[PDB]
Amino acid sequence: KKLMAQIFFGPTYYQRLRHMVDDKIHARARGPMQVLTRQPVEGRSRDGG
Amino acid sequence: NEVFSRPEWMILTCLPVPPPPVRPSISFNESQRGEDDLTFKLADILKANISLETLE
DNA sequence: AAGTACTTGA
RNA sequence: AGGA
DNA sequence: TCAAGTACTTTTTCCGG
């Protein structure tokens, strides 16, 4: 069925940006600890909290 | 306060040495140290003290 | 970016 | 060096 | 004795080499 609204439709140059979900996603549930503070390590890479 | 903080105690005679947990050696590999800053600064104090001790 | 505390000449 |  | 500069102090949202 036709949309009651007419859509503004045409080409537009769109860029793919550096930031991708799978490079961002992180989860921890126990893991590496600092030596000094005996607290969780820093950053996704290191499996930080 | 006469029990926990007499004025004479702001002047250090005997210095508490903190244990390794405070100044841990970041022991990269086997035969390579990695002693903490505080471990070094204490050695400096210790060294400075022996020069003075022997000197007098 | 704005203070507390301390010291300096009238 | 970047992201909200 | 008190104005004015001095020493000198201190903070500032959140999350890869």
Which of A34, A36, A38, A41 is the best substitution to test chain B (most B C-beta atoms within 10 A)? A36
Full DSSP string of A1-49: ---SSPP----------S--HHHH----SS--B-SSS-SBPSSGGGT--
Q: Closest nucleotide (CA of A19 to C1')?
A: D3
Cα torsion angle, A12, A18, A20, A24, sign: negative
Determine contact: A36 vs chain B, CB below 8 A.
yes
- Residue B31 has φ and ψ, to the nearest 5°, of -80, 70
Phi and psi based region of residue A30 (left: phi greater than 0; alpha: psi -120 to 50; beta: remaining) = left
Tokens found for residue B18? 């903190």
Question: What was the resolution (in A) of this experimentally determined structure?
Answer: 3.5
In whole angstroms, give the CA distance from residue A47 to residue A40. Answer: 9
Amino acid at the residue A6: Q
The coordinates were experimentally obtained by X-ray
